[PDB]
Design an enzyme around this catalytic site. Structure first.
Site, mmCIF file in Angstrom:
data_model
loop_
_atom_site.group_PDB
_atom_site.id
_atom_site.type_symbol
_atom_site.label_atom_id
_atom_site.label_comp_id
_atom_site.label_asym_id
_atom_site.label_seq_id
_atom_site.Cartn_x
_atom_site.Cartn_y
_atom_site.Cartn_z
ATOM 1 N N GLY A 17 -5.422 -10.272 9.877
ATOM 2 C CA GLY A 17 -5.107 -9.997 11.460
ATOM 3 C C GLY A 17 -4.453 -8.789 11.630
ATOM 4 N N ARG B 210 -11.807 -40.439 -34.814
ATOM 5 C CA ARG B 210 -11.440 -41.573 -34.065
ATOM 6 C C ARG B 210 -12.365 -42.825 -34.097
ATOM 7 N NH1 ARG B 210 -11.916 -40.239 -27.453
ATOM 8 N NH2 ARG B 210 -14.073 -41.094 -27.794
ATOM 9 N N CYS C 213 -7.155 -33.629 -26.441
ATOM 10 C CA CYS C 213 -8.856 -33.384 -26.642
ATOM 11 C C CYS C 213 -9.716 -33.607 -25.486
ATOM 12 C CB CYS C 213 -9.122 -34.331 -27.941
ATOM 13 S SG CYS C 213 -8.622 -35.959 -27.912
ATOM 14 N N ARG D 159 -3.576 3.254 8.643
ATOM 15 C CA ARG D 159 -3.749 2.033 7.967
ATOM 16 C C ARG D 159 -2.375 1.227 8.015
ATOM 17 N NH1 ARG D 159 -6.753 5.035 4.223
ATOM 18 N NH2 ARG D 159 -8.833 4.671 3.945
ATOM 19 N N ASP E 253 -9.871 -39.381 -19.604
ATOM 20 C CA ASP E 253 -9.520 -40.832 -19.074
ATOM 21 C C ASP E 253 -8.228 -40.908 -18.442
ATOM 22 O OD1 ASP E 253 -12.030 -42.433 -19.962
ATOM 23 O OD2 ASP E 253 -10.887 -42.687 -21.873
ATOM 24 N N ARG F 298 -8.849 1.715 -8.818
ATOM 25 C CA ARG F 298 -8.681 0.364 -8.865
ATOM 26 C C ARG F 298 -9.076 0.120 -10.523
ATOM 27 N N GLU G 291 -4.322 -41.866 -23.467
ATOM 28 C CA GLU G 291 -5.133 -42.005 -22.409
ATOM 29 C C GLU G 291 -5.104 -42.845 -21.256
ATOM 30 O OE1 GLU G 291 -9.179 -42.082 -23.878
ATOM 31 O OE2 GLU G 291 -8.707 -43.386 -25.342
ATOM 32 N N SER H 206 -2.563 -37.517 -29.285
ATOM 33 C CA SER H 206 -3.829 -36.776 -28.841
ATOM 34 C C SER H 206 -4.146 -37.243 -27.258
ATOM 35 C CB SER H 206 -4.937 -37.059 -29.765
ATOM 36 O OG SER H 206 -6.095 -36.045 -29.275
ATOM 37 N N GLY I 83 -5.978 -37.453 -24.000
ATOM 38 C CA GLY I 83 -7.362 -37.844 -23.495
ATOM 39 C C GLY I 83 -7.383 -37.763 -22.211
ATOM 40 N N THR I 84 -7.010 -36.735 -21.701
ATOM 41 C CA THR I 84 -6.872 -36.284 -20.258
ATOM 42 C C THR I 84 -8.243 -36.510 -19.484
ATOM 43 O OG1 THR I 84 -7.736 -34.030 -20.856
ATOM 44 C CG2 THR I 84 -5.308 -34.266 -20.591
ATOM 45 N N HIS J 294 -26.851 -32.083 -15.073
ATOM 46 C CA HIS J 294 -26.447 -32.859 -16.578
ATOM 47 C C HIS J 294 -27.140 -32.090 -17.648
ATOM 48 C CE1 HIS J 294 -24.708 -36.655 -14.353
ATOM 49 N NE2 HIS J 294 -25.597 -36.389 -13.591
ATOM 50 N N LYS K 96 0.832 -1.093 0.057
ATOM 51 C CA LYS K 96 0.067 0.008 -0.034
ATOM 52 C C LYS K 96 0.816 1.235 -0.088
ATOM 53 C CE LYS K 96 -3.739 -0.592 2.126
ATOM 54 N NZ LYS K 96 -4.566 -0.713 3.345
ATOM 55 N N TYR L 287 -1.061 -28.297 -30.188
ATOM 56 C CA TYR L 287 -2.463 -27.750 -30.370
ATOM 57 C C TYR L 287 -3.557 -28.599 -29.224
ATOM 58 C CZ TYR L 287 -4.341 -32.226 -32.092
ATOM 59 O OH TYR L 287 -4.536 -33.697 -32.270
ATOM 60 N N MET M 108 -4.076 -4.802 12.275
ATOM 61 C CA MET M 108 -4.771 -3.626 12.949
ATOM 62 C C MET M 108 -5.738 -3.036 11.802
ATOM 63 S SD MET M 108 -3.896 0.051 14.492
ATOM 64 C CE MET M 108 -4.456 0.990 13.125
ATOM 65 N N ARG N 150 -15.797 -38.215 -32.686
ATOM 66 C CA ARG N 150 -16.141 -39.286 -31.991
ATOM 67 C C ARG N 150 -17.099 -40.032 -32.752
ATOM 68 N NH1 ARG N 150 -15.827 -35.511 -27.191
ATOM 69 N NH2 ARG N 150 -14.689 -36.547 -25.511
#
Ligand SMILES: [Mg+2]
Ligand SMILES: [Mg+2]
Lengths: 862, 862
Positions: free
Chosen positions: A104, A607, A822, A95, A760, A329, A736, A755, A757-758, A444, A25, A842, A106, A550
């Protein structure tokens, strides 16, 4: 000045770099002053002074008070006022503030240097009721924060006064009432502390400083530091400054504003001013009363934007025709305003593209990808309920209660709002036809809408859907089939009637901003699409091709296609099981031609079948499942039942699926490869540029991949010969399975591209069944066992290490290995950032997430 | 000799080290000769000669034939016979052989150097029928393998002869008939090759050599080499040797034997001899006819054992009172014989312990861990069927058809054979009470028996079990409840009646052998046991403690315990849900006291609840599941149904289980920790040494482990205070999640020991649901996609890398981290070997696998 630094308009011993000594500050105040901002004068006690304090026997260091006095004198001489003087009064604010955030400490203390004499000198121009009300508050505040007197002692007399007076909502207390409380408060000082309230301004200040130094070692402050293992610090600083008021006559006031319109981005001061202090009045009214003030405000705002390179949200106070800058700000703003401001500032030569890119947040950009209402406020008198923003976007259509009806409306080119107490995987067809969905952020239905970029208000429990009858109970109104209804998937509101939708944007600023984004990013951004229409929507959103099509999703498209798959699974003779595959070939070939045309000139990665065969079977009571299969395929009951049981699995996510199916039933992969290559040639013959890519799902060994690759290349040779033409193509694999990452060097011998498959990969790495993880994730997050849900935010430490190992080892084997991802993390900002620095080529996400991905891929680089 | 090396009794130019030049077979022949074995003389053409052959225009090299002639002359002069001489005839054998195994090479050719003149000279002492039968075969063989004449041409005249003669089973063909065929065969040489059969022995040999050299580049031989990427080789050698016969009068014969009894290990020649060639006669009969021969045999066998340090299975031929050693190989033997031989050879000072350890195979040792029949042959006249060796071991008991009945028999101290067409997880209780199981190697019953070390003959489909009635249809006999029946889980036989069981072994040789095993191994071997009785059986098998006590298995012990768990899961008020936990505490505490006493002085590692709660629910139609739960717990239908659905999961292997349950329901882990510590103290107070270890299942982050560790330590403090006593203990974790391996350094901060759960680790790493993998594994193995089933044989390349990473990173953080494995690979020889070299501290397996583990842990080190 080695421990106390003063500051004022265009004057300050410290500078923006001293975050260590002056605290965060302090350094900012110095910077604000250093650039000529009209900030009330003051000074800052370095963090060293706090260290020497706690070290020299936790007592006030030698010489400090001397410097502090210099500082105050400097400020007094500067402001034309003195500490503890009714005529020329000087009130201060104290301040705290370290180099980093720290709880915590002052609490802020306003109007220090106040007493009975000064309070009266204050009632002079500001008024009596205000003066003593302020004196009361100060006695309370200073007593609790500086003298450690329980607030309760003070509140005991504040409510005991009303019990005699006649009110409880403080604001009715008259001037004399306040003066009476002032007296009663000071007695609290004698009763609790034993000694009297320090009436000498200097004594107050001294105490206040000591109060701050002691706040560094407070309970809360230490626990916090102890938890984050924060060391080295050295302590907190003490920021002192002059108080100012806009109630000293009609030559004073207070106001707030945004240097630019936070809703539209228009380069115009946007705010409001309050005279002598009611209800606010706009800006233009300020100059017409305090010219020299409004002019100073203008130069202050120009300075802010020139130096901070960003629109600002501020609070200022003009005291007796003299303007003061109190709070500044970076200003919150809508996405529309964010993009316009970023682009105008570049055109103004204020910021360069690389910096403008950081001014628009993913949330800002998202707002511009979906249609919006013209005035969410103009329809406040029409809102009839509020739910959850399942999927952002504005929608206007006629109410309907069945998917079939929604689809019907869509087929006639009309807008419908699908309304169901809850939804199911069977209504997915109608949910896509509806322009909006409404059910009675985790539902869902919500998730589904997001990908499509469709409006959806879920969890609107305050609704009852009458099916028997074609109406719905919402709020106080009843809506029947055919009636108009508006939905805001961003706010969650359910307006009534046909509200207007903002027309397409013509500024071209989004296009301009996005070109910078696309120039800076290195990662290409592909789309996950399984239909010709989604491919088109992805291209319109800037997708550079399709990273994942897919094939299983290409069958749940129509009852006919689904039955065709079941016929295949129930075939009695291979003479027919091939006839069933031959039937699936046309559907596939037709869909691929469509996708290829929409992606003319761009790579398309398709795929091979991935879901377990069980998925294509009807649902419900076993007896009924058997009946349907016999009627649909011609099988008898015994065989149908045996087949259903045989396809049943304990853990389908790790069962007989992916390449395991393709390897066990070669004809299946041969059919799909034929479909792909024939569609490719047909479209090439029509002048479409086709760059097909075939990907093998769920591989765990080089052998599984090799087996499928051989099959694919064989079919390619025959199709090319039979059609007398050859075109380039690529074979690759999904990564995957954790094992695949481990032996990625071997796998890279056959795969031309990787590729990830995060989805799975995350399931197998954590051993988390996403279908069932919902039973303990909430607890894990609440208990701090998990920082984020791994399925939304890539776990960089774990899953991330496997992505890195795989990428490195795969490229060491095949240097030009193309590597993408993907899984859903492909459209998540922090995940996209990790993939960029990991050296991926990519990312591929849903169509409407593509612009977000693009933005994120650029932001990580600047 | 640089290309042709001769060899004979105590003479040979080559030596046992020349596997490169002389090929594997050549080097062995040289070695056998070099140590004084009575091997017929001969010579070997180096692999260089084969290289120079293919290189010098694939033609016979210069000087080679010269050397070959030297060799033959040397052999002729040696044997007292000449090539192509009726009076002093010399017949040869020509075999190929590279440095390594290699298919597609020229087949062995016997009796080379034979012709019409020699054939007659042969009929002299061996007989006419034999001579011409041999001449016929040679013409055939030499013609097909050396001259490339289709065997069909020869067989065309062999069966065309019977069509005129009167037989088809060659053996009736008279001497003249053979002479007629000899003539007809030679004509085949003129018809097919154009030229006549080379009657000059020398020409035959030359051709034969060339035939061998050309066999190196044969189709089969090249494909094989091409598949294994076998390079450098250089070619194959040519091993030539003299033929010998035991039909030249009563001063000749042939015999085979084991230098030691292959069934008992008794140090005595065990074989049979055939005079002049009927049915064989034992050894003692040889000396009583050919003294100088039997004496030579004796010295030959002593040499074999002295040099090869192993019992030998051989084939010898004594020709005219002169013994000849033809084939020698390490002799197959029973486990009983393997252990006795290994121990006697050490006592004889022939081999040292480190070498004896390698003489007993896991299969050998297994045989000695279970009871066996006294004579599987003595009961041949009683066998009534044959099935699959589901689980080795002999068993004798009364036939029963229900688990309940088996348990009943067991409770009265009687032996019963449980017989069910098939088994289920509910009969597990009776299967353990039965001394033997029989159902109508992969069946689920078989697997279960193995761990218990119980006899089991599964897949005996040739059986019909009549339930209504208490009888079973097996073979031709019918067996009713109470009738005696014998089962051989090793052979799969189902004898009839009460066959005798070999009495306990008193030799002490197994104890002696195992002490060497235990001295050499570095890995400790623990046991996986969940009951006091299994703990005892493990200790009796040499277990050094318990590496895994599965607490979930301690509840499926009795209907009462199971209902207690269900009551817990269905509790309505915490006041009762605790009362249900309190009920589970006694069962646990009681079981732990029992286990601790049985393991007095050894570490005992107990794992916290791991299975998903759904597992403790009844099975069957939903309506029935609900009814049972209401009756067992007092819940109403609505709540029971809601609870059942709520506990249902899509992928239970990755669902709400393990520490996820322990973390979400702290009281559960607090109950188990209390049970453990209280049992520990109670047994210590009785003088038992208790070294308890608490393990947290399915951890994926340090936080999950820390949370559970804190809970455990808190309960330990209270219990120790409440009982006024403290004892040491350890907290650790399972490493079965791939992520845990990745962040093992962090996890090691809280865990004192690591225990790999390779079952689950393998499932998550490969993404294989073991419950469902059976649908494609057979295909993967058949297609060469997998070398072995990963669940039986540790995948060293994948799962193995994670075990290594985890071990290294965990120990880097906590140097004395104890690291073990409790998955099933813990008892599999090749897996145990990998764990030893990976630097693990121990392995833990089922009780009866413990000795195998011990053996494997030693064998890998020598
Ligand atoms: Mg996947
Ligand atoms: Mg496990």
């Amino acid at each position: 000045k080695k421990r106390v630094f003063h500051f004022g308009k265009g004057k300050s011993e410290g500078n923006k770099t001293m975050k260590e000594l002056l605290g965060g500050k302090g350094a900012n105040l110095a910077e604000m002053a250093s650039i000529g901002l009209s900030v009330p004068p003051g000074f800052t006690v370095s963090t060293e002074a706090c260290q020497q304090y706690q070290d020299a026997g936790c007592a006030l260091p030698a010489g400090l008070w001397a410097e502090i006095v210099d500082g105050l004198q400097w400020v007094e001489e500067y402001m034309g006022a003195t500490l503890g003087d009714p005529q020329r009064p000087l009130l201060l604010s104290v301040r705290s503030g370290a180099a980093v955030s720290m709880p915590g400490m002052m609490d802020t203390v306003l109007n220090l240097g106040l007493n009975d004499e000064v309070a009266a000198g204050l009632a002079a121009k500001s008024g009596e009721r205000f003066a003593y009300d302020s004196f009361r508050r100060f006695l309370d505040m200073f007593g609790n924060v500086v003298m450690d007197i329980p607030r309760s002692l003070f509140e005991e007399k504040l409510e005991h006064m009303k019990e005699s007076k006649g009110l409880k909502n403080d604001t009715d207390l008259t001037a004399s009432d306040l003066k009476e409380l002032v007296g009663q408060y000071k007695e609290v000082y004698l009763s609790a502390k034993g000694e009297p309230f320090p009436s000498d301004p200097k004594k107050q200040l001294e105490l206040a400083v000591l109060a701050v130094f002691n706040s560094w070692e407070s309970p809360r402050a230490k626990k916090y530091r102890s938890i984050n293992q924060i060391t080295g610090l050295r302590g907190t600083a003490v920021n002192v400054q002059c108080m100012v008021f806009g109630n000293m006559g009609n030559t004073s006031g207070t106001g707030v504003l945004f240097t630019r319109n936070p809703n539209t981005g228009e380069k115009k001061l946007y705010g409001e001013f309050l005279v002598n202090a009611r209800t606010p009045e706009d800006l233009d009214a300020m100059k017409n009363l305090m010219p020299q003030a409004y002019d100073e405000l203008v130069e202050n705002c120009n300075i802010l934007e020139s130096h901070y390179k960003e629109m600002q949200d501020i609070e200022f106070t003009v005291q007796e025709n003299r303007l003061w800058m109190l709070q500044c700000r970076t200003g919150k703003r809508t996405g529309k305003s964010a993009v316009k401001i970023a682009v105008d500032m570049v055109n103004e030569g204020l910021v360069e593209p690389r910096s403008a890119i950081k001014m628009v947040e993913p949330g800002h950009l998202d707002q511009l990808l979906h249609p919006q209402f013209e005035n969410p406020s103009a329809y406040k008198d029409q809102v009839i309920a509020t739910g959850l923003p399942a999927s952002p976007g504005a929608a206007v259509g006629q109410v309907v209660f069945t998917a079939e009806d929604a689809e019907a409306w869509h087929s006639q080119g009309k807008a419908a709002i699908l309304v169901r107490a809850e939804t199911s995987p069977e209504d997915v067809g109608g949910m896509h036809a509806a322009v909006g969905i409404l059910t009675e952020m985790t539902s869902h239905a919500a998730v589904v809408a997001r990908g499509w970029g469709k409006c959806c208000v879920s969890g609107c429990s305050g609704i009852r859907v009458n099916d028997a009858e074609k109406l719905v109970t919402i709020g106080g109104h009843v809506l029947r089939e055919g009636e108009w209804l508006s939905l805001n998937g961003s706010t969650g509101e359910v307006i009534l009637g046909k509200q207007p939708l903002s027309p397409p944007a013509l500024s071209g600023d989004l296009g301009t901003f996005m070109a910078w984004v696309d120039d800076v990013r290195k990662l290409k951004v592909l789309a996950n699409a399984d239909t010709p229409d989604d491919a088109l929507t992805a291209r319109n959103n800037g997708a550079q091709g399709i990273g994942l099509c897919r094939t299983e999703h290409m069958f749940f498209a129509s009852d006919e296609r689904i039955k065709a798959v079941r016929q295949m699974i129930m075939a009695p003779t291979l003479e027919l099981r091939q006839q069933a595959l031959d039937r699936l070939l046309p559907y596939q070939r037709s869909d691929f031609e469509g996708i290829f045309r929409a992606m003319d000139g761009l790579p398309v990665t398709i795929r091979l079948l991935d879901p377990p065969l069980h998925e294509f079977l009807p649902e419900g009571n076993i007896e009924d499942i058997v009946s349907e299969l016999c009627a649909e395929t011609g099988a008898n009951q015994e065989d149908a039942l045996a087949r259903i049981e045989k396809l049943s699995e304990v853990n389908p996510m790790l069962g007989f699926r992916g390449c395991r199916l393709g390897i066990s039933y070669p004809e299946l992969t041969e059919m799909q490869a034929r479909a792909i290559f024939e569609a490719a040639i047909a479209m090439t013959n029509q002048g479409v540029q086709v760059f097909p890519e075939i990907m093998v799902p769920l591989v765990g060994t080089p052998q599984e991949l090799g087996h499928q690759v051989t099959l694919i290349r064989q079919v390619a040779e025959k199709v090319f010969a039979n059609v007398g033409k050859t075109i380039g193509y690529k074979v690759g694999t999904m990564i995957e399975i954790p094992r695949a990452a481990l032996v990625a060097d071997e796998i890279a011998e056959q795969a031309e591209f990787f590729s990830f498959g995060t989805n799975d990969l995350t399931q197998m790495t954590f051993g988390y069944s996403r279908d069932d993880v919902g039973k303990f994730i909430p607890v894990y997050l609440a208990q701090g066992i998990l920082q984020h849900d791994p399925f939304e935010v890539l776990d960089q430490r774990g899953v991330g290490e496997l992505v890195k190992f795989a990428t490195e080892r795969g490229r060491k084997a095949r240097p030009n290995l193309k590597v993408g991802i993907c899984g859903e993390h492909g459209g998540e900002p922090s995940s996209v950032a990790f993939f960029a620095k990991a050296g991926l080529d990519y990312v591929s996400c849903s169509p409407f997430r593509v612009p977000i991905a693009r933005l994120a891929a650029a932001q990580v680089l600047v």
